[PDB]
Amino acid sequence: ILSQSIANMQQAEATIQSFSGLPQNAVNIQQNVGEVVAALLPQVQTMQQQVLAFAARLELQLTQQLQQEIAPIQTLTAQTLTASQSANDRITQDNIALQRIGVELQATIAGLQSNLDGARQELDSLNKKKLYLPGLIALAVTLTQTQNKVSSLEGQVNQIEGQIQRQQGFLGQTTAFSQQFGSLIDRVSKVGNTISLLRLFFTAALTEVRTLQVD
Amino acid sequence: ILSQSIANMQQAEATIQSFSGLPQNAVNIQQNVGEVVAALLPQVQTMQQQVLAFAARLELQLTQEIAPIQTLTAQTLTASQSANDRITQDNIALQRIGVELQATIAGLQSNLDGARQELDLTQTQNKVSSLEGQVNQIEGQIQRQQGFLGQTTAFSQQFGSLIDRVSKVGNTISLLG
Amino acid sequence: ILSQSIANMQQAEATIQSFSGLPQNAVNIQQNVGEVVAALLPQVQTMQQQVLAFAARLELQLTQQQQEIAPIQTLTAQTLTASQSANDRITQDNIALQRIGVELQATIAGLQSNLDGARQELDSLNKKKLYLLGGLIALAVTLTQTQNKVSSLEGQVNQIEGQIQRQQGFLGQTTAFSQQFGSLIDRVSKVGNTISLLGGDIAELARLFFTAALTEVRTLQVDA
Amino acid sequence: ILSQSIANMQQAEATIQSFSGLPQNAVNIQQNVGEVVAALLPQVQTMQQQVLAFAARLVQQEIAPIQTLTAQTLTASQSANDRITQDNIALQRIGVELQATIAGLQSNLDGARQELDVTLTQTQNKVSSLEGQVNQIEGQIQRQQGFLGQTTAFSQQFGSLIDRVSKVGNTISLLGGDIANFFTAALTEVRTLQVDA
């Protein structure tokens, strides 16, 4: 789960670097992601090996019998937690802000799709006249005038369709990335809890080492 | 298409009129949608009878009527255009309310993540339980509002088909005049 | 969450019943959602009362210091297995609809190809029309035959766009309904479990096991 | 629209080439889009320029090349697109079956995960695996939702380009009908051909 979390985030990374010409909150997420996968994720890989190592010793010392060591791996599980949470908290707010922009694009391509349908209707009409048809001369300039009018609004809209398309894609990525990171923070947190909750003395502790070892 | 439109617009009204408790903009649509389904659509069904008869009493005399029909076509087209433009604005108002709810589950979900990680002692237990309960409240409202938005969006789009089709009948009536 | 999921499950029902002319799979869900709201949710509410009441009685007895765990733990198990069953049937019917969903995608891609083939045909005929402006009367009959086929496929596309939209909409609902129901099962199970470990505990070392029993009585109450 | 269709198809394709370790239907699309960007789009640029130069101004000699080009550009573009649209449907089928395999896993995980809520470690391992297994199917399903997100967007932009190209290819035909035979019609058709590109 740690590892799959890590692996998945690693694979979304390149896909999130692939987008160009997105808003600043999207560039923020791009930068954040890059820092996490480069710096933060190997940190989590390091704590996990130190946790599996600290636990491998103490398991045997517990079985046999039937602290000083904890400290530096408590410290590390707590930074990793903190750091993870705050990077991820920075993604959550950037995601929310793209959501708001998402919507405002929608309302703008209202105007552009409502006005385009006036011109596409006007041109449909001219285009029936042309096809059924002195008459043809009286229609010719108006036709082209209206053709120009639709292509133009059709260009403007297709512009914003591209923006909307891109930002929806992007957001799919960073939401997914957030899903996974969260899974990573739950499990780090979980290992945080147990590095604290460390015959019936050693028996209890041994379950806490085993859970550590499975987590 | 015109028959297909009207009929699909009938089903989507019945679904839209099943939601209760929704915000300001969501009732605005609920009322608009029954207006269309109850009165405006009959006027589209009507004009079809009359357009198709007009279109039948020329077919004979190829093998005065123009104005009283193009007037009812062009009024139907315009009444529909404004009603659909109205629903459209309310939709983006609901999207905003939507995103705002995403912002609130966000704020709650953190305070929960905090107290819930601290769970894993009746003090913690109640604090989380309230925060759990609360975020299941904001999700319930989110799912329903997406549900509702899905149905008005599907209403609107189907309206626009009927708009295409009505406009097109008018354009032919126009050319024959 | 017990009570809040139930609300969300209740509000959503009416909406789920409102859909007409949907595939058999949707029709099963509809019927199931009907029975869940009618029969189970009231039985969940009864369980919740009986547990809250049991918990109040044993709470005082503990901060002062089996027969009436039997009835109230079978009820809990019964409520779980019934709920899980209903719910599993909603999972299996949704995936079926997800499959129907993609085949509909395949249909409309088919109706599209054919729709483009027609459009061309008309436009091939309207080439032969530019020639005949050199039996342009003959072509008017074969110009509506095709005008009428292009119209027909557009009508079919349109029919299958509505079907797609309408079904996706319903998946929207029954997925939300299911997400909620899972939250219920989670809570019922938690409740049942705590009512087992209670039994277990309740079955000087006394003052300890009693103060644990209290722990699980207290949580019982927070959880129901 | 032509340029805006191209530009969007380019941006879409960089993201599409970023996906890695995806099923075959995935890797097919990857290949098929990289082609479309490097092959079909240059020609679409070319033919836009050539129709525009031609549409400001014997002329049966001037249409002949520019008709077949358009008509060739169109037929390749429809083949590319139609093969994206099947890999599309096929990927969605892989997607749905992926939801199905969790629908079976997650059931027996719910079992063990309630059983958790000697003893503790038989429990814990199973839930570890079941949990990992399910969490893996999740990952694939997001990457695929992601991919399909993009090929679908690519495929819609493509559709919009193909349709214009089809519009400009039916005008050139119209125009050559008018010329060979009227000057007025031909004029209204070349003015339609200047608007489209």
Q: Which residues of A touch B174 (CB under 8 A)?
A: 125
Interface membership of D142 toward C (CB under 8 Å): no
Nearest CA in chain A to B110: A89
Q: Which two tokens stand for residue A19?
A: 């987008």
What resolution does the deposited structure have, in angstroms?
2.6
Cβ atoms A17, A30 nearer than 8 A: yes
Q: Which residues of B touch C141 (CB under 8 A)?
A: none
User: For residue B35, how far is the Cα from the chain centroid?
Assistant: 12
Whether C21 and B1 lie within 8 Å, measured CB to CB: no
Dmax (CA) for chain B in angstroms is 91
Nearest beta carbon to residue C155 from set B1, B17, B125: B1
C-alpha closest to that of A194 among A211, A177, A169: A211
What is the C-alpha separation between A74 and A79, in angstroms, rounded? 9
Buried b (16+ CB within 10 A) or exposed e, B140-165: bbbbbbbbbbbbbbbbbbbbbbbbbb
Place of tokens 């491998």: A56
Whether D195 and A147 lie within 8 Å, measured CB to CB: yes
Rounded to 5°, the CA angle B104-B109-B112 comes to 135
Q: Which residues of A touch D156 (CB under 8 A)?
A: 165
What is the C-alpha separation between B15 and C16, in angstroms, rounded? 8
Q: Which two tokens stand for residue D90?
A: 């096929």
Tell which CATH architecture fits domain C1-223. Answer: Up-down Bundle (1.20)
Chains C and B touch (3+ CB pairs under 8 A): yes
Where does chain C break, by residue before each gap (C–N > 2.5 Å)? 65, 134, 203
Interface membership of A128 toward B (CB under 8 Å): yes
What is the C-alpha separation between B158 and C163, in angstroms, rounded? 12
Rg of chain C, C-alpha, whole Å: 30
**Residue D93 distance to chain C (closest CA, Å):** 7
Interface membership of C108 toward D (CB under 8 Å): no
Cβ atoms A83, A183 nearer than 8 A: no
Class of domain D1-195: mainly alpha
Dmax (CA) for chain C in angstroms is 115
Q: Which residues of D touch A136 (CB under 8 A)?
A: 184-185, 188
C-alpha closest to that of A208 among A1, A62, A53, A46: A62
What is the C-alpha separation between B173 and A128, in angstroms, rounded? 11
Interface membership of C121 toward D (CB under 8 Å): no
Touching partners of A (3+ C-beta pairs < 8 Å): B, D
Cβ atoms C55, C216 nearer than 8 A: no
Interface membership of B124 toward A (CB under 8 Å): no
- CATH number (1.20.1170.10, 1.10.540.10, 2.10.260.10, 3.90.79.10) of A1-214 reads 1.20.1170.10
Q: Which residues of B touch C18 (CB under 8 A)?
A: 14-15, 17-18
Interface membership of B147 toward C (CB under 8 Å): yes
What is the C-alpha separation between C150 and B3, in angstroms, rounded? 17
Interface membership of A99 toward B (CB under 8 Å): yes
Interface membership of A110 toward B (CB under 8 Å): yes
Nearest beta carbon to residue A155 from set D4, D19, D191: D4
C-alpha closest to that of D72 among D172, D187, D165, D195: D165
As a residue count, chain C comes to 224
Q: Which residues of B touch A124 (CB under 8 A)?
A: 167-168, 171
DSSP string, B68-81: HHHHHHHHHHHHHH
Local structure of residue C21 (DSSP, 8 states): S
Q: Which two tokens stand for residue B28?
A: 């605005």
Interface membership of B171 toward A (CB under 8 Å): yes
Between the CA of residue D163 and those of C116, D157, D159, what are the distances in Å? 10, 10, 6
Buried b (16+ CB within 10 A) or exposed e, C82-102: bbbebbeebbebbbbbbbbbb
Chain C residues 73-92 with CB within 8 Å of chain B = none
- CATH number (1.20.1170.10, 3.40.50.700, 3.50.50.60, 2.160.20.10) of B1-177 reads 1.20.1170.10
Whether C15 and B147 lie within 8 Å, measured CB to CB: yes
Buried b (16+ CB within 10 A) or exposed e, C125-135: ebeebbeeeee
Whether C4 and B133 lie within 8 Å, measured CB to CB: yes
Cβ atoms D16, D30 nearer than 8 A: yes
Nearest CA in chain A to D6: A162
Between the CA of residue A82 and those of A78, A91, B114, what are the distances in Å? 6, 14, 11
Where does chain A break, by residue before each gap (C–N > 2.5 Å)? 66, 133, 198
Write D184-190 long-range contacts (CB < 8 A, 24+). Answer: D184/A136, D184/A137, D184/A140, D185/A136, D187/A140, D188/A130, D188/A136, D188/A140, D188/A143, D188/A144, D190/D55
Touching partners of D (3+ C-beta pairs < 8 Å): A, C
Nearest beta carbon to residue D4 from set A144, A159, A173: A159
Mutate to test the interface with C, among B33, B129, B139 (most CBs of C within 10 A): B139
CA dihedral for B108, B109, B110, B114, sign (positive or negative): positive
Provide the H-helix boundaries in D39-118: 40-56, 60-116
Cβ atoms D33, D148 nearer than 8 A: no
What is the C-alpha separation between B162 and B3, in angstroms, rounded? 9
Mutate to test the interface with B, among A103, A142, A208 (most CBs of B within 10 A): A103
Chain A residues 180-199 with CB within 8 Å of chain B = 185, 189-190, 192-193
Local structure of residue D118 (DSSP, 8 states): -
Nearest beta carbon to residue A106 from set B92, B103, B174: B92
Whether C88 and D82 lie within 8 Å, measured CB to CB: no
CA dihedral for C4, C9, C11, C12, sign (positive or negative): positive
Chain D residues 16-75 with CB within 8 Å of chain A = 17-21
Q: Which two tokens stand for residue D94?
A: 């892989």
What is the C-alpha separation between D154 and D27, in angstroms, rounded? 15
Nearest CA in chain A to B160: A117
Residues in CB range of A60: below 8 A, 6 or more apart? none
Where does chain B break, by residue before each gap (C–N > 2.5 Å)? 63, 120
